[PDB]
Structure 1
């Protein structure tokens, strides 16, 4: 795998693909 530059909803997509059935939590600052 390569390093990622992911902003906005692209990060959530990436989390989705990485975590699958486990799901994930999305926790921005502030």
Structure 2
């Protein structure tokens, strides 16, 4: 699920699944 174009909610979902209990930061304008 990571090796594709991931945008918007799809990208946030991937970060969520990958990062697990560490959580993540989503900074689309940085």
Unaligned ranges ≥5, structure 2: none
Report the number of matched residues.
30
Instruction: Please provide the CA RMSD for this pair.
Output: 2.0
Larger Rg belongs to: 1
Unaligned ranges ≥5, structure 1: none
Q: 1:2 to 1:26 in 2, by over 3 A?
A: closer
Q: Which runs of 4+ in 1 moved over 2 A?
A: none
Task: Judging by fraction of residues, say which structure has more strand.
Answer: 1
User: Normalized against structure 2, the TM-score is what?
Assistant: 0.78
